[PDB]
Amino acid sequence: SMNPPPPETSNPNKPKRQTNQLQYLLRVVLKTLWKHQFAWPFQQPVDAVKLNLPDYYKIIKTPMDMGTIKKRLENNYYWNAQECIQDFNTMFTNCYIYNKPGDDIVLMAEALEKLFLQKINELPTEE
Ligand SMILES: Cc1cnc(Nc2ccc(N3CCN(C)CC3)cc2)nc1Nc1cccc(S(=O)(=O)NC(C)(C)C)c1
Numbered sequence: 001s002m003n004p005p006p007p008e009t010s011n012p013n014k015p016k017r018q019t020n021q022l023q024y025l026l027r028v029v030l031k032t033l034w035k036h037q038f039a040w041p042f043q044q045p046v047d048a049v050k051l052n053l054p055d056y057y058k059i060i061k062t063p064m065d066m067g068t069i070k071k072r073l074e075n076n077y078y079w080n081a082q083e084c085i086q087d088f089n090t091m092f093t094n095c096y097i098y099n100k101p102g103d104d105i106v107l108m109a110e111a112l113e114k115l116f117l118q119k120i121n122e123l124p125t126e127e
Pocket residue numbers: 040041042046051053094095098099104105
């Protein structure tokens with residue numbers, strides 16, 4: 001089967017704003033996770049075709065990845081910081097759903113999620 005289209009990253013009909021929290025999510029949170037040694041499998045939508053995973057998009061109906069999250073932030077797609085946080089959580093939980101406890105890719109996600117939670121603990125108060 002084909003890959004689904006990637007999640008929307010721009011919508012000219014969605015209102016836009018800049019907040020210090022969204023700036024932090026891009027400049028601090030995303031940036032720190034992106035450079036992590038275990039980040040690479042989470043940097044783009046899963047290409048189930050190239051990876052030969054016929055069941056991936058049978059199981060994962062709400063795909064999400066850091067490339068999509070980054071594009072959303074660069075485009076001012078998010079209105080609330082919580083939208084972005086929800087997207088990271090969806091990414092992590094999709095990993096845990098598709099795979100099994102103890103799998104290498106799960107350990108990788110766990111490492112990234114721990115770091116994510118550390119950075120979110122330092123989220124500045126909404127100005
Ligand atoms: C975000 C994400 C969540 N789950 C899985 N699981 C996964 C993917 C591929 C495989 N295989 C199956 C065996 N086959 C020969 C190649 C890849 C196994 C599990 N992969 C993810 N991303 C991913 C992105 C790019 C490449 C790969 S990967 O290099 O094909 N797979 C591992 C070795 C990292 C697990 C994986």
